[PDB]
Symmetry: C3
Subunit: 163 residues, 3 copies
């Protein structure tokens, strides 16, 4: 059982009424697995602010997994990967590759995500794309090895079954 934080990165999340549907898509993928969503926040497309939350969640809250979504595109404003890399002690390129659906012949556009994956302290951090469909496919691609990955990073155990 691993504590997960979902961070939705966009300035559009501070412009009034809209339901964060990507957040919901992510929860669905995790449903049933050794995961418990212990945090959820919206943050602007401002590296300083993204880093403050990631820093807080890893260093103080001690979350096991942080799934950010959005800001990984080719647009000059998408700087989630850069902001994240600067906070990582080491990266896990294999997970970044899985999120791009490399060699799966599933969704070609998924290859454009610059999202990174890495560890800070005892917290695994993955940058998922910003659309509901994108975040969903990228997370489902890593799901099979996510519990094993988290057990190594966090040193915490997990049970193979329904939760």
């Amino acid at each position: 059982m691993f504590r997960v934080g979902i961070l939705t990165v966009s300035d559009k999340g501070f412009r009034g009424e809209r339901q964060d549907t990507t957040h919901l898509a992510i929860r669905e993928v995790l449903a049933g697995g050794p995961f418990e969503v212990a945090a959820y926040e919206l943050v602007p497309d401002e590296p300083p602010m993204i880093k403050k939350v990631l820093r807080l969640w890893a260093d103080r809250e001690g979350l096991d997994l942080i799934l950010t979504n959005g800001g990984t595109g080719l647009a000059p404003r998408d700087r989630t990967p850069e902001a994240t890399r600067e906070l990582l002690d080491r990266e896990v390129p294999g997970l970044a590759e899985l999120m791009r659906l490399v060699g799966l012949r599933k969704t070609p556009m998924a290859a454009l995500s610059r999202g990174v994956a890495g560890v800070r302290g005892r917290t695994l951090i993955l940058n998922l794309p910003g659309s509901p469909k994108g975040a969903r496919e990228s997370l489902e691609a890593v799901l099979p090895v996510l519990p094993h990955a988290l057990s190594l990073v966090t040193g915490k155990p997990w049970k193979e079954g329904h939760h």
Copy 2:
């Protein structure tokens, strides 16, 4: 559409030891697509010369896409990736992975290409392998998402 620059990097080709037929393969791949070759150049495996052309096409000419080919192997002098990375604002690893044909059941020689992919200003730059065959397969691998990637980097639309 998008203006493209093709930069062939080869010591042998530059010194006239052999002819460049790779650009010919690249042109065919682009034919029929929202691309138009605005420039072509041949330089040796020398970072200083590779960069001069990259800066020129991106900063002066403002080309939308730069496709280099060659100098991405494991040979000591193959230094196109290093030269290119020095000029990029940010990289797009997904495209570099596509050019290495990652995922094929049969381990490809393409995996030996150290080519990178990235953005400088509003120009997308891709390092394709130097062989005609290699450059073709690598370019075809990215073609499906090339137009969209370019629209995102340049801001220009296509049809």
Copy 3:
């Protein structure tokens, strides 16, 4: 005929808790190929000790290929990638990708290996995962292009 060094990185094996059977799997994969294992070493998950052997084999022994196994995972003690990367003149990301078995329909546990691949001087170095299964499967993935890669890196010819 390329000279190979096998470096096993394992706290347990170094402590003598359980013997190294991974080198056996590696040797079997290379059997029948233009390879001769000239050196074997066993060290714990300690960067200084890992670097010491890598420098000795690349700089003093002149080995052509170094295959390390172990210490590439996500556990806090796994630092083979860091220790290795810092000694490389250049990286060959395509080989690191092949070792992660990227592209399998079923997400592989190999995706959790942070092992790198690169060149130091005229020596090609690859970080394989630590289990017999892990090292075996990752090495089989790169085997098809290994002789070619070494010929380019070492300058030594190969049919």
